[PDB]
Each structure stands twice: as C-alpha cells, then as structure tokens.
C-alpha cells in the first residue's frame, strides 16, 4: 500500500545483433457497460446495409494493446534501425503491470468526490490458450501512446460472431470472460509475465537495386530465339517466320527464369481533384471481395507498387495504408489531412496496383482470325513468381494472428508485420464490481534481433534524414501546447540489396 | 503423416474479426463528389469504423473460387470460403478519368493470393499445392 510495486523503465539498448526496447506508460481504466455483458447489433445503431451487418457483444473487460511500432521505438531509435539494418524480428516479450490505484467517485451536487479505495481489486488475465477472439490484429485505436508522457485510456473489449442480418444463428458463440481464471490485484500487488515469440521470417527493410526483368547481363547475347517477323511486308500470302537472337539490343523479349508476383488491380484516383471523374465511385467503383453475400472492400490488398515510376499524384483507391495527421477529424477530412503512404520501393519486383498484370492471347489465329488479346486484371500465384511483402511503417501494426484454418498461403498479413499462429496473448483487465476506475503503470519490453548490411555497393546509400531549414517547430516533437505530432510516416526500406 | 482433420465450423466469419467497439486508425475514401456545389469533384476521407464495417482494412482474405452454375430444386465453411454460385468479387478494368467512368468487372475464378485462408471439404509429380484431395 505504501511501497512502489514496480519501477519506471523506458530506453533502448543497442547490443551487437540484438535490440532491447522497453516502453512504460500510464493508463486509466473506467467501468464499461455498468459491469454487464451487453449484446450489440446494427439494429441498435440503425443497421443500414447488409454489408455492414454484425452481431456481437460488449464486455466490461478492457485490454492492453501495444501492437503498433511507435509504442516501442522513439523516432530516433527507429531511424537507427531502417538506416543500418536489412531485417528484424521480435524474439522475447516481457510484460509488467503494477502500481494499481483504484479510485471511486461519489458525486455530490456540482463537485464530484474522489478518494482512494484501499480494499478494491483489479482483475487481469491473459488468453494464452487462444480460446477467446483475437481482436489485436485489425489495427484498432487505443494502443499505447507514441509519446511517453501521454496518459491513455484502456479500450473496451468486444467481439462479433456468426449472423444473418441482425439476427443470430445456432452456431454463434457467446464467451463469458468471468469463466476464465484471473489474477486479482489490490493496490500493492503487481502483474508480470514473459513471452517467447515463435519463429517468424525477418521482415525485409531494404529496397532491391535491380528490377525483376533487368537481371540480365547487358553485354552478352542469349542463345534463345524469339519470333521477330510474321510477314515480310504488305501483299497477299505474305506469312513468314523470322527468328532473331534475343540480346541487349532488344531486352524486352529475352527468356527469363522468374516473373513478378500476384496482382489484383485497384482503381486509381488522383489527388488533384479535377483529374477524377465527376461522379460517386467511392464504393461502386472500388475493388472488393465478396463473402457470404456480403461485399468486402479490398483494403489494403495484396502487396503491389502504388504507382508507375515518375507519376506520384495518383494512388490506388483502397490499396494504401492511409494514416492521418494529428487533429484530423473523424469524418470527411480533406486530402491533405490524411497521410497517404505509397509503395515506391516495391515497384521493382511487384506489379503496379493500378495497371494490368499483362496480356493473354484470347483466340486462335488463322487466315481469317486476327490474334486477339485481353488484359489480365487479376492474377493469382503461378510457379516462378517472386514478390515483396508490404512495408511496416512506424505507425503501423507489428503482428496479427493467423486465423486457425486448414491451410493458408504466405500468412504474412496484408497491413504489414509478422503473421503468427500464437501471437502475444491478449491481456484483459476490469474493475471488480463494488462508480469506480483504476490507474497505474504499464511497462512492455520486446527484444528485437537484427540482420546487418553486408553489401559491397560503392556509392553511398539513400538514408533517412531530418531536414535543416529553420522550421517553426522541430519534427517529431511538441508544439507550444504539448501536442506530440508525427508529421510523416516512415518506411523501413532505405538500404539496398541485389535481386 | 497427415495433418489432423478439422471437424468444426468456425464461429466467426472472416470479414468480422474486428473489434466492434473501437475505430481503426486507418482512413478509407468515403466521398468523391461534393454534391453541394453541383457535383464539383472533391476528395474526402473518413475513419473506417464499426458504423461502416465493409470498408475496414483486413489482414486476410477468403480463399480461392472457381465458379459453378446454380441449379434449383458445404454451407458450414461459408465463413472463410466464397459461395460457389457467386462471384469472388470485383476488379477495376480501366483507369478512371474526367472523360471516362470507372468500370468494374466480376471475378469468376480467383487463384491463390498471399494472405488467403480457406477450409477444405497424391500423384508423383514435380510439384503440387495443398495435396489434400477433393
């Protein structure tokens, strides 16, 4: 009651090939749903469309979410990663919760009363058997703050289940979290547990210096032949076959061992407002995968370059993680109030999102039938394809749980990060019913492992830097109101590798 | 040595894995026309949120589909796999522009993509994919 149940740890220790990052924050937990499990469905909120239909529950339990990078890395630390390293991946997670303080409010007339409640408890437990839904993969808000001095609020835990419209079905599952053995903490207890990440492939934080189709030697001729001329000239019965040697003169036709990865085309919209069509094509014209008669928008989509080299005004409609600048409203914000990330780096080995994958010959030529081709809008995996996965921005997610299923292909999640079949367990918390809320400290520590840049490239790399032009306020810092603002999203890919 | 057979129906659908009470930090493209200024083009973003769940960015997508014809007279896996009589979804055929409307077309067959998950229902060869028989 009178002695600190834990200490304050925030720092980063760069040791050899490993990195140890520790983040500590101060949180507040209110009471949700008046200590009740409450059913929720769109019928409560008006239930406009069948696409948006959901059936689920809301629990008083709150949960801790550290799933975003900027929780762990200060901007400068992050810089020391993207600049010097060709890869990273988490090894150990060590979580601590302590210094619980339970407060109670008896409101009398205008001024409310707040004082310590000593005998109150705060229940906390983790789901390490994965019997509960896993909501930490969808990039929800409520995570630890980017800036240490920010005191935050634990999000409310909710989940959804099978449904037809707002009605339920027999197979819908209802989980009571009280049914779980959980630790109970008074103002002197603390909570701690450690976690060992399962083996995941290094995330790549390098940009290929070569393009998939230029891997050739420019000085030498292949020994493969291609068909140059099917006629000599104009006339009657001019058909002929003329093979040439593929070589540096014409490089488009050479035989190649590998081909770019999969593509599902996104509609491309311009940031100059007037190059866009004068109609509402936001939902009607967007790409979307359909499931059980419910249409789903394809966001962010498979990993594909955002635009052709040299044109940057345009962006794929849903094909890009779109963050937002601080102060950005929650509705109908302008084009510049959002920060639209673009995959410039992965264009070399991956198809462009807003372009076709290619052509196919759609009929059989004869004297009476021309060769007819048609575009490939969507292209799935073929033998030989190589591709790069989406980058992880400093604001983006770290991991996501792989839905437990029969099979999967390349589980790495589409918003970035590390797909895992046993991700870091959820951490649930609530105030035991006895008006009540609790507060305290949370320190989370992940140990990251590195892959150093070994390359022999002669000229200097492109590195991430901070400008020097006398701005009113420094980037990644506070304004005069103490508002920590992250001005631009930071890719992980600066150093270069060969293809 | 074969994988343990799965004999259960998933409680939740693939697209609904979200937390219904909390917004994502990601934005989607809500509104492409003003409508007040007599259809001046405009570009507006809004938070993907539980109010509109169709638009939220998802980490995984349903498995492959190769369409069949519906005849009138496997419904348990309808969570992670598309309906055999319905299109997999839409793609955009052309670039929009001021003089051309955005066009979309149906995906009748869809191969594997990175990030697909699916539920189920060997030759001697150089390669196969997911050998589990049909």
């Amino acid at each position: 009651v009178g002695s600190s149940s834990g200490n304050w740890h925030c720092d980063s220790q760069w040791l050899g090939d490993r990195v140890i990052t520790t983040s500590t924050r101060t949180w507040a937990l209110p009471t949700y749903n008046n200590h009740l499990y409450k059913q929720i469905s769109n019928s409560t909120s008006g239930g406009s469309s069948n696409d948006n239909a959901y059936f689920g529950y809301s629990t008083p339990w709150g949960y801790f979410d550290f799933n975003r990078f900027h929780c762990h890395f200060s901007p400068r630390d992050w810089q020391r990663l993207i600049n010097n390293n060709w890869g990273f991946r988490p090894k150990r997670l060590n979580f601590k919760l302590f210094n619980i303080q339970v407060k109670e409010v008896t409101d009398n007339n205008g001024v409310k009363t707040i004082a310590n409640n000593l005998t109150s408890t705060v229940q906390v437990f983790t789901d390490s058997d994965y019997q509960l839904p896993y909501v930490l993969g969808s990039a929800h808000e409520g995570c630890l703050p980017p800036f240490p001095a920010d005191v935050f609020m634990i999000p409310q835990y909710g989940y959804l289940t099978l449904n037809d419209g707002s009605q339920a079905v027999g197979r819908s599952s209802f989980y009571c979290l009280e049914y779980f053995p959980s630790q109970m903490l008074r103002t002197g207890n603390n909570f701690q547990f450690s976690y060992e990440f399962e083996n995941v492939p290094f995330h790549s934080s390098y940009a290929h210096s070569q393009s998939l189709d230029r891997l050739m030697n420019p000085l030498i001729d292949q020994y493969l032949y291609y068909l140059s001329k099917t006629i000599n000239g104009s006339g009657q019965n001019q058909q002929t076959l003329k093979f040439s040697v593929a070589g540096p003169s014409n490089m488009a036709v050479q035989g190649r061992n590998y081909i770019p990865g999969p593509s599902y085309r996104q509609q491309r919209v311009s940031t100059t407002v007037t190059q866009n069509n004068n109609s509402e094509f936001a939902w009607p014209g967007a790409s979307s995968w359909a499931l059980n008669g419910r249409n789903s928008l394809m966001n962010p989509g498979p990993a594909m370059a955002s635009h052709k080299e040299g044109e940057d005004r345009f962006f794929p409609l849903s094909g890009s993680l779109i963050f937002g600048k601080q102060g950005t409203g929650r509705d109908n914000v302008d084009a510049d109030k959002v920060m639209i990330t673009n995959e410039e780096e992965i264009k070399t080995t991956n198809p462009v999102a807003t372009e076709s994958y290619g052509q196919v010959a759609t009929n059989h030529q004869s004297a009476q039938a021309q060769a007819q081709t048609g575009w490939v809008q969507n292209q799935g995996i073929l033998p030989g394809m190589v591709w790069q996965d989406r980058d992880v921005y400093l604001q983006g997610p770290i991991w996501a749980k792989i839905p437990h299923t029969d099979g999967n292909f390349h589980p790495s999640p589409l918003m970035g990060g590390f797909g895992m079949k046993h991700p870091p367990p959820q951490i649930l918390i609530k105030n035991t019913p006895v008006t009540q809320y609790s507060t305290g400290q949370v320190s989370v520590e992940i140990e990251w492992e590195l892959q150093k840049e070994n390359s022999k490239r002669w000229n200097p790399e492109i590195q991430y830097t901070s400008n020097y032009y006398k701005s009113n306020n420094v980037e990644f810092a506070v304004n005069t109101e103490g508002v920590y603002s992250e001005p631009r999203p930071i890719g992980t890919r600066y150093l270069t590798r060969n293809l | 040595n074969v994988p343990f057979h799965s004999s259960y129906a998933h409680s939740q659908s693939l697209d609904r894995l979200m937390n219904p009470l909390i917004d994502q930090y990601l934005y989607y493209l809500s509104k492409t026309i003003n409508g007040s200024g007599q259809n001046q083009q405009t570009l507006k973003f809004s938070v993907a949120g539980p109010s509109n769940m169709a638009v939220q960015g998802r980490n995984y997508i349903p498995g492959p589909s190769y369409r069949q014809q519906r005849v009138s007279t496997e419904e348990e896996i309808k969570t992670t796999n598309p309906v055999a009589t319905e299109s997999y979804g839409q793609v955009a055929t052309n670039h929009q522009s001021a003089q051309a409307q955005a066009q979309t077309g149906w995906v009748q067959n869809q191969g594997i993509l990175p990030g697909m998950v699916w539920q189920d229902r060997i030759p001697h060869t150089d390669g196969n994919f997911h050998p589990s028989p049909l």
Partner: antibody, heavy 123, light 105 residues
Framework: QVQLQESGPGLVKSSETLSLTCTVS??????????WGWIRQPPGKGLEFLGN???????YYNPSLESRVTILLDTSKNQFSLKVNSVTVADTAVYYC???????????????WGQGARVIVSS | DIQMTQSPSFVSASVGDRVNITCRAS??????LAWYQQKPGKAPKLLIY???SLQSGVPSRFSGSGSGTDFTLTISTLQPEDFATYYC?????????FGQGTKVD
C-alpha cells in the same frame, strides 16, 4: 503563413539555361502535402502556367513550353527550382512561385504567391 | 488548351459604382474557376476559388456565381483601394489558363 521568395540571375544570355529557385518559409514541403507550381507573366500580358510539382516529386509540365522546363524539388533545403533550357528573347517575364493547393482545391488555384522574380533574357 | 475571354477588356467605373467582370470558358469547365487581383507590379492574389466561395483574406464585397459556361465577378460598393486587373483561371483540365485581363478604373 507561407512566405515565398524567388532568387537566381536577373539576366541570362540567350540560349543559356535559366534557373530560379523558390525557398518556402512557413511550411515543410515534405509534410505539407500540397502542390507547388510556377507561372510566368510576359510583360503586359496574361499569366501562363508553367507546371507544378507534387510534394513526392511528381511533376506536370505545360505542353506549350516544349520540353524546356524542368522543375526540381529539393526537399531537404525546403525549396524547389525552375530550369528552362535554350532561353530566347521571347521567354522574358516576371516568374511567380506559388503554392498550388488548399484542402478542397489542392493543385488547382494558387492561394499563396511569390514576391515575383524579374528575368530578362538578352544577348 | 481552353481559351478564356473576359468580356470587358477595360472597364472604367469609379468609386461606389457596382462593377461586374465576366469571363467565358471556351468549353464547359464544370464551375471550376479562380478570380485573381493584380495591383501593378506586385504578384496577383486569389479572390474567389471554385465558383462562388470567397477566400479568407478577401473582403465581403467580392462575389460571383458561375453557371459553368458563364462567370461573373461582381465588385460591389467598389472602394478606391482596388483598381487592378482581374484574371480568371480554369481548374477543369490541364493546362490551366488565365484569360487576358480586365483592367478596372
């Protein structure tokens, strides 16, 4: 508030490249998310657009000018440079720098303008 | 390109008297416009963006409503502070074009 200053030579020999630079104070080109563009005012005549450059480096040029103009974006020093090649007597006017965008009208109407820069092409 | 022609080339109208300047786009611009004001020798400054939406800096007196092939800038209660040329701009399609100029007196 966004103050825009142009600098460079005020006299250029004919068929010598022309170079001006606009150093924007009050915003950060990398994180402002607005278009930056040039126009030119041949004396006593209507202004004609030259081109603009989006903050990521993409560029639009005016076809009337025939592939002479090139707009380079130096983001670290927070300034962008106009370069027009093979200058002639006809290509002499006051060159304005401008911020091409706003919330609703980004890359359309020029809200904030340079002080102006006189360039006289002569032999 | 799309031409822009402001109908009065030189409109001499003194203080207090209402003035209206009209510029017609060669082809429909879908109400995308931008009237500007240039006092002699200084760079121009924006006045009305889109069709009728006033800029924050500019005084309430300036106004104008385009039908999309027709546009007018009505300077109401003209004060002596502004005698300047006036340009209009299309935003509809590249390249952006500023027609002529309307010098007012």
């Amino acid at each position: 508030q966004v103050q825009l200053q142009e600098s460079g030579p005020g006299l250029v020999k004919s068929s010598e490249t022309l170079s001006l630079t606009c150093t924007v104070s009050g915003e950060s080109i990398s994180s402002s998310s607005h278009y930056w563009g040039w126009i030119r005012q041949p004396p006593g005549k209507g202004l004609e657009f030259l081109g603009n450059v989006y903050y990521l480096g993409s560029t639009y040029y005016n076809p009337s000018l025939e592939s002479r103009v090139t707009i380079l974006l130096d983001t670290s020093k927070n300034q962008f440079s106009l370069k027009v090649n093979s200058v002639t007597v006809a290509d002499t006017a006051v060159y304005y720098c401008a911020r091409h965008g706003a919330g609703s009208y980004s890359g359309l109407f020029f809200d904030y303008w340079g002080q102006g820069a006189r360039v006289i092409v002569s032999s | 390109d799309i031409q822009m022609t402001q109908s009065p080339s030189f409109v001499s109208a003194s203080v207090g008297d209402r003035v209206n300047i009209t510029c017609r786009a060669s082809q429909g611009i879908n109400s995308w416009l931008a009237w500007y004001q240039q006092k002699p020798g200084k760079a121009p400054k924006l006045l009305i963006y889109s069709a009728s939406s006033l800029q924050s800096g500019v005084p309430s007196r300036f106004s104008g409503s385009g039908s999309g092939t027709d546009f007018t800038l009505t300077i109401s209660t003209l004060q002596p502070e502004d005698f300047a040329t006036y340009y209009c701009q299309q935003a509809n399609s590249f390249p952006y074009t500023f027609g002529q100029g309307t010098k007012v007196d």
